[PDB]
Design a protein around this ligand. Structure first.
Ligand SMILES: [Zn+2]
Ligand SMILES: [Zn+2]
Length: 704
DNA sequence: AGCACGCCGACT
DNA sequence: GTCGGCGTGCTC
């Protein structure tokens, strides 16, 4: 008989072999019910052949075959298989992550009638306090008066079906089945909204994409906000939609502004399906089949929407391609942008990466000749060198602050991220604590009695006096969630303070990250970036870029939305070249410079990076386990000169809570060479018996 | 991951 | 004398 290698939803980097009951034909990509020691669990058959590696007598059989045809097209299958090894995640978790939950649970991949609880119209007219002390029946009807509740979703909510049942008894609610709907849109597909009123460059862009709309093509569409990136998306979609092919457009988690959705639903008289994290499992399933069956012209979604099955997909476009939201950071740590062009190239399709602030790596491939580029077309910097600081603010700015709160306006003050790792700086002369081993910046660690370089793990006592000018007023950098509110309120009394990370009125809102493109602040007239020092002297080589991204966003947003609001910058080094080139020459010029020196130090995107992080409860066991794997990695047959593994080094968040976090960084000029290096070294991880008593994670191409 | 087996505190 | 803590280990 034949050997069924089936992948299982367990964190084990390998398939499991079983036998077919002869007469059973399951191609790879089908779900099979299969015994797994003590449980009965589902698996995708990764491959069926006629040669195993263990006694065929021991090998249990497969219980049942749940799919006649694979639930993956060959393109998305190949794509998942490649990503499983490039990212080094257990193939079973990768394959399952890519399916609707109901398909991970072995239910049939066909349409099923959806049952919903709805409020009767007495249920929407009877006074809600009429049953005020009826426990949850009340809050159940509350939720009902905002929309239909699915039966199986009730379990996730605070109330139970008992309440809904008691309501149905009292005539307030009722259950029913929303029968599906068939739609043939390809016949009689027009466009509402308007006819296009494009200008010259948008026209040229649509032409360039159209003249290649069939072969693989990667287009970076670069244009600042309001230059009509979306427009040329909808013209591109139109052309692709005329053929009868389908379109997939991806946005950030917080990029689903009903503004953007309502615009798409108007332009086409074809079905659009939009996937936001708030849909239940039945809505996610049916959308999966509607897309695959062709009954859906357009799918709009986020990171996960990349794995959507398409009868005939014609184009895929991702907005705000620079957004970090496209890199999952729990579990399987894939990057939807990179996997997107892979799915685009393997489908022979145009991919459109639209951005107002393009990622440095995509700019790097544009230059390298792998994407083509399609283009569309006050302030004050305040030197803090010596000025007395009032809770971290500069006098020349606090006075320019009150003048803005004077007219009952609002103000955003932007700091570095929560948990930023701080440098050391001389308040008077600008000298920064550098490492005596590499020309890297030292990370200060006040409670630990020492400095510590994150690139070479050196240590030095905290120097009490500046070794270039001699001021005793040596300060850290970055303020973040240190409750600037506490030091701030005494100076701005009766003025409230809040945060904008997840009406009118004069106030100060601190910020730690970039704003959402569909998230404006109407009452804000003043924005100041206090994060320039932390950005420019960080242990994170990407801090500058993220800053320069935030700067060009808040400079164009507040600067020319229609009011003349001001941006102020607070650096101990206004003379800095990268800082100035950004300020007076724009993001693209800064980018070209930042790219050109990422190369001199040999970091992404010129090199490839891989972070292995492990944490423990004693600070002694995780590091040395990494030190062993470090030594084993270097002993790989494919190691040569270019591979470097710095570490082990404590993570930039040393002890989040009680556990202690250490990490090891691998880098190499060749992405797949390094993929082969760790891929081989990973099959022999059982050599180190401690790899199963630390919590270890593997992060390919990290964002940090 | 599940779900074992496997040796030491508070309870009938 | 129990019923139960989760510390290592396996699952074709
Ligand atoms: Zn100094
Ligand atoms: Zn160093």
């Amino acid at each position: 008989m034949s050997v069924a290698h089936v992948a299982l939803p367990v964190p084990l980097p390998r398939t499991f072999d079983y036998l077919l009951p002869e007469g059973m034909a399951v191609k790879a990509g089908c779900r099979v019910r299969v015994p797994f020691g003590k449980q009965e669990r589902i698996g995708i058959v990764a491959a069926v052949s006629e040669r195993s590696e263990l006694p065929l007598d021991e090998l249990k059989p497969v219980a049942e075959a749940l799919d006649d045809e694979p639930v993956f097209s060959t393109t998305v299958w190949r794509l998942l298989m490649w990503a499983a090894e490039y990212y080094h995640h257990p193939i079973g978790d990768v394959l399952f992550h890519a399916l609707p939950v109901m398909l991970r649970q072995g239910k049939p991949a066909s349409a099923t009638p959806l049952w919903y609880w709805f409020a009767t119209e007495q249920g929407q007219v009877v006074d809600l306090n009429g049953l005020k002390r009826s426990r949850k029946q009340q809050q159940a009807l509350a939720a009902l008066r905002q929309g239909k509740i699915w039966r199986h979703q009730v379990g996730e909510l605070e109330f139970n079906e008992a309440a809904l049942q008691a309501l149905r008894g009292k005539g307030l609610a009722e259950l029913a089945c929303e029968a599906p709907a068939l739609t043939d849109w390809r016949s009689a597909y027009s466009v509402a909204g308007e006819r296009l009123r494009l200008n010259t460059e948008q026209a040229t862009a649509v032409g360039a994409i159209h003249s290649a709309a069939d072969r693989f093509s990667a287009w970076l569409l670069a244009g600042i906000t309001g230059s009509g990136k979306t427009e040329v998306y909808l013209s591109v979609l139109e052309n692709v939609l005329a053929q009868g092919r389908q379109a997939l457009v991806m946005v950030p988690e917080i990029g689903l502004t009903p503004q953007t959705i309502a615009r798409f639903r108007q332009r086409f008289n074809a079905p659009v399906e939009v996937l936001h994290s708030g849909l239940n499992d039945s809505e996610r399933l049916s959308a999966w089949l509607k897309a695959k069956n062709g009954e859906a012209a357009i799918v709009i979604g986020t990171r996960s929407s990349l794995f959507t099955p398409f009868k005939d997909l014609g184009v895929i476009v991702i907005d705000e391609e620079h957004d970090s939201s496209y890199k999952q950071q729990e579990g399987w740590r894939y990057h939807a942008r990179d996997l997107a062009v892979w799915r685009a190239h393997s489908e022979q399709i145009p991919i459109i990466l639209g951005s107002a602030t393009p990622a440095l790596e995509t700019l790097h491939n544009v230059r390298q000749g792998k994407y083509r580029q399609l283009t569309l077309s006050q302030q004050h910097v305040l030197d803090l060198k010596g000025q007395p600081l009032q809770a971290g603010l500069s006098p020349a700015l606090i006075s320019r602050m009150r003048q803005h709160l004077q007219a009952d306006n609002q103000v955003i003050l932007f700091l570095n991220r929560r948990g930023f790792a701080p440098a050391l700086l001389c308040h008077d002369c600008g000298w920064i604590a550098e490492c005596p081993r590499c020309d890297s910046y030292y990370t200060l660690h006040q409670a630990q009695h020492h400095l510590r370089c994150h690139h070479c793990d050196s240590q030095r006592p905290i120097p009490r006096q500046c070794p270039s000018c001699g001021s005793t007023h040596l300060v850290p950098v970055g303020i973040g969630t240190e409750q600037l509110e506490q030091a701030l309120a005494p100076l701005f009394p009766e003025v409230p303070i809040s945060r904008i990370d997840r009406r009118g009125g004069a106030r100060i809102l601190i910020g730690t990250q970039m704003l959402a493109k569909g998230h404006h602040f109407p009452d804000v007239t003043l924005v100041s970036l206090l994060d320039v020092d932390g950005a420019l002297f960080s242990a994170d080589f990407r801090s500058a870029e993220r800053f320069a991204q935030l700067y060009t966003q808040v400079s164009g947003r507040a600067g020319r939305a229609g009011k003349q609001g001001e941006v102020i910058l607070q650096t101990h080094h206004p003379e800095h070249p990268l800082l100035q080139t950004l300020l007076y020459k724009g993001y693209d010029a800064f980018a070209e410079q930042a790219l050109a020196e990422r190369q001199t130090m040999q970091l992404p995107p010129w090199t490839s990076h891989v972070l292995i992080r492990a944490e423990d409860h004693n600070n002694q066991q995780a590091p040395l386990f990494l030190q062993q794997l470090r030594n084993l990695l270097q002993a790989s047959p494919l190691a040569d000169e270019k591979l470097w593994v710095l570490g082990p080094v404590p993570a930039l968040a040393p002890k989040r809570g009680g556990r202690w976090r250490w990490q090891i960084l691998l880098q190499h000029p060749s992405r797949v060479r390094l993929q082969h290096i760790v891929s081989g070294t990973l099959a022999l991880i059982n050599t180190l018996p401690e790899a199963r008593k630390v919590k270890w994670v593997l992060d390919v191409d990290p964002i940090e």
